[PDB]
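Below is a filled-in request sheet from our internal design queue. Each sheet records the structural input a requester submitted and the sequence that came back. We keep these sheets so that new team members can see what a complete request looks like end to end.

REQUESTER: design group, bay 2
PRIORITY: normal
MODE: inverse folding
CHAIN LENGTH: 339
BACKBONE (tokenized):
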């Protein structure tokens, strides 16, 4: 019979033994296990998406992207375990390097030195440069999706919400539904954007930088609507130039209806922060997405001078160019290489 963990089947075959329940992830149960071929403990996450088209989409995205990408700052897939036939395929197990912790857990309890903040931010952006060079948007960057090992090597994970960039089709109406994590949501998402441009990710990285500086999320919106409140509460009212860039009347007039708010200076919010870090923060957390700094510019910012080296910041060789039953088949096919 298959191995059991906390009631349910965690059937990872003979190669992976000594299972330990690590916790719950976005996809379900996650366990550590000893890899008998490589003699290391690994992370294994159990995925059960086949009953629902939406779950299948996210699982396929996660798998297809992570299998294509190969980068020091992006979590790899080492192995995928599943049944030999589609009919028997019940669950999929994704095997990854075991990572001590993640930035969410770390920030709950640990103060980061400026050196750590700098190093973490460099790695995030180095990983993001690769992702963006593949014409892909991560779209759910947040501390819990940044894994760390015992020597603080950082790896971006969870590409379930990722999309191919589509800037020509980015415009939408005001207060249009969105799925990515609220606190890390760029202001344009609530105004006139579907989140199909690279600038969406940079905003999230800015929030992450802010959160590393203080151990508190900078824009902790209590609900969808509240999020924009928090952002404007710190950036202050948008300029006329920036309003003029928003053609949609509902969005623009909403902003015009608000009482004036002044910018809160970054150095008053973060009195202990490196001034160069605050300069970079300001550029990532720019209201107008067209004026927001891009990943390659961020890497070249003086804050990151100790690490910046474009020849050692690789890009993707092959960028991405663009029902559940077919999705299960696609997932089955995408995972075939591990049989
Ligand atoms: N690669 C890896 N390593 C761990 N611990 N991971 C994990 C992922 C989700 C929840 C708990 C742990 N993932």
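RETURNED SEQUENCE:
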């Amino acid at each position: 019979g298959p191995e059991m963990v906390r009631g349910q089947v965690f059937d990872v075959g003979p190669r992976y033994t000594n299972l330990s329940y690590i916790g719950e992830g976005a996809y379900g149960m996650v366990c550590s296990a000893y890899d008998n071929l490589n003699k290391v403990r690994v992370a294994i996450k159990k995925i059960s998406p086949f009953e629902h088209q939406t779950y299948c989409q996210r699982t396929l995205r996660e798998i297809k992207i992570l299998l294509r990408f190969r980068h020091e700052n992006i979590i790899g897939i080492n192995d995928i375990i599943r049944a030999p036939t589609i009919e028997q395929m019940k669950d999929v197990y994704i095997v990854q390097d075991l990572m001590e912790t993640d930035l969410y857990k770390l920030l709950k309890t640990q103060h980061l030195s400026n050196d750590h903040i700098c190093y973490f931010l460099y790695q995030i952006l180095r990983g993001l440069k690769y992702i963006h060079s593949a014409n892909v948007l991560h779209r759910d960057l947040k501390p819990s999706n940044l894994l760390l090992n015992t020597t603080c090597d950082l790896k971006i994970c969870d590409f379930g919400l990722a999309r191919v960039a589509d800037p020509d089709h980015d415009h939408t109406g005001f207060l249009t539904e969105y799925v990515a994590t609220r606190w890390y949501r760029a202001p344009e998402i609530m105004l006139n954007s579907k989140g199909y441009t690279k600038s969406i990710d940079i905003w999230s990285v800015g929030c992450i930088l802010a959160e590393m500086l203080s151990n508190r999320p900078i824009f902790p919106g209590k609900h969808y609507l509240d999020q924009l409140n928090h952002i404007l509460g710190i950036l202050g009212s948008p300029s006329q130039e920036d309003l003029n860039c928003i053609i949609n009347l509902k969005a623009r007039n909403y902003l015009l209806s608000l009482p004036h708010k002044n910018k809160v200076p970054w150095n008053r919010l973060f009195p202990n922060a490196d001034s160069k870090a605050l300069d970079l923060l300001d550029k990532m957390l720019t209201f107008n997405p067209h004026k927001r700094i891009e990943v390659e510019q961020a890497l070249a910012h003086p804050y990151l001078e100790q690490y910046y080296d474009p020849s050692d910041e690789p890009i993707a060789e092959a960028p991405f160019k663009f029902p559940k039953e077919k999705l299960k088949e696609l997932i089955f096919e995408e995972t075939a290489r591990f049989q």
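SHEET NOTES:
- The pocket of 1-phenyl-1H-1,2,4-triazole-3,5-diamine is lined by residues 22-23, 25, 30, 43, 75, 96-99, 147 (CB under 6 Å).
- Residues 61 and 295 are 22 Å apart (CA to CA).
FILED BY: M.R.
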